A paper describes a structure:
As the most abundant viral protein encoded by the M gene segment, [name] (M1) forms a shell underneath a host cell-derived lipid biolayer to connect the vRNPs with the viral envelope in mature virions. The full-length M1 protein includes 252 amino acids consisting of a highly organized N-terminal domain and a flexible but less ordered C-terminal domain that are linked by a protease-sensitive loop. So far, only the N-terminal domain of M1 has been structurally resolved at an atomic level, showing that at neutral pH the physiological monomers have a high tendency to oligomerize via a so-called ‘face-to-back’ arrangement, whereas at acidic pH the N-terminal domain exists as a dimeric structure in a so-called ‘face-to-face’ arrangement.
In sharp contrast to M([name]-88R), both M([name]-88E) neutral and acidic structures are in a face-to-face-oriented dimeric mode and lack pH-dependent conformational switches. As for M([name]-88E)-acidic structure, it contains two face-to-face-arranged dimers. On the other side, M([name]-88E)-acidic has monomers A and B associate in a face-to-face arrangement to form dimer 1, and has molecule C similarly associated with its dyad equivalent to form dimer 2. All three M([name]-88E)-acidic monomers superposed on each other with a r.m.s.d. of ~0.5 Å. However, least-squares superposition of the two M([name]-88E)-acidic independent dimers 1 and 2 resulted in a very large r.m.s.d. of 1.2 Å, indicating that the two dimers of M([name]-88E)-acidic show significantly different dimer arrangements. Dimer 1 of M([name]-88E)-acidic is more like M([name]-88E)-neutral dimer (r.m.s.d. of ~0.6 Å screw rotation angle of ~8°), but not its dimer 2 (r.m.s.d. of ~0.6 Å screw rotation angle of ~15°). However, dimer 1 of M([name]-88E)-acidic is more like M([name]-88E)-neutral that owns a strong bifurcated hydrogen-bond interaction between Tyr100 and Glu88 because of the G88E mutation that makes it more difficult to dissemble M([name]-88E) M1 in acidic conditions than M([name]-88R) M1. Dimer 2 of M([name]-88E)-acidic is significantly different from all other obtained dimeric structures by showing neither apparent contact between Asn85 and Arg134 nor apparent inter-subunit interaction involving Glu88. Dimer 2 of M([name]-88E)-acidic likely represents an intermediate conformation due to incomplete transition after the pH drops.
Residue numbers in the entry:
A (entry chain C): 2 to 70, 76 to 161
B (entry chain B): 2 to 71, 76 to 159
């Protein structure tokens, strides 16, 4: 059910703790439409401990996307590197997602790319949020999160 | 000097005014460090008739590079425009190269080898990523752009 799928790919990369609680709550809040001030949330997010800049960006992005009403700290994190090759393949991924309509198609083709590219793709979409349907944008964030979580593992 | 080089290329893509003169007057004004608040200017630029949106956005870009008060949806909409794939591809590539340029004439000569839609696309990237390129190089870009746009007009 849409919310529950981004709610569990996003919540995934967030390190276990109390922060995990508040974020979930703000997630299902805005997903309902309860408390929709984006700058209220952005302010809270920017100040948060534990969360890497990237994680903050993915979260910013999602929030920006789920609200009905742009921050540098988000933008900087997704773009990071600005590695010419991640970028080149961000642009290639992006063009494919323009033709996409569903969360699942977007998600599937996104996982055929690198973590660097997906971060980059998001940094392109952040400033072009309308350029892709909402399901497809989420499918990007979820794919991004998923691979972040296919690295985080032991031995 | 660069500030007047930029000027002539900008006025190049604006029809005879004399809103044109209101514009030439405002570019000169900021370039001499006059009393200039970016918002008031952008607001005044947004509103303007006659000026096609792309023109507003090149202007806006140019002001952003030259006025203090430290984004604008209409400037961004003008430059990114369509948010079109084969233009972004060429613009991203141009973008990384512009990071490496240090001069005005270096940027200008590179950029003029790419197409105008890509050049507008790249100004979009740089407007979004404001400090990633140097002002001299950014100026080499807008002039590159204005030269392509204007030598298409005939």
């Amino acid at each position: 059910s849409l919310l529950t799928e981004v709610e569990t790919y996003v919540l995934s990369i967030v390190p276990s703790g109390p922060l995990k609680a508040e974020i979930a709550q703000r997630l299902e809040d805005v997903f309902a439409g309860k408390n929709t001030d984006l700058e209220v949330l952005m302010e809270w997010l920017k100040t948060r401990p534990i969360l890497s800049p990237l994680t903050k960006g993915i979260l910013g992005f999602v929030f920006t996307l789920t609200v009905p009403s742009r921050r540098r700290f988000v933008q900087n994190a997704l773009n990071g590197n600005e590695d010419p090759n991640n970028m080149d393949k961000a642009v290639k991924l992006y063009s494919k997602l323009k033709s996409e309509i569903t969360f699942h198609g977007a998600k599937e083709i996104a996982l055929s790319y690198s973590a660097g590219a997906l971060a980059s793709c998001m940094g392109l979409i952040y400033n072009r949020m309308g350029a892709v349907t909402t399901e497809v944008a989420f499918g990007l964030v979820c794919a991004t999160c998923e691979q972040i979580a296919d690295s985080q593992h032991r031995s």
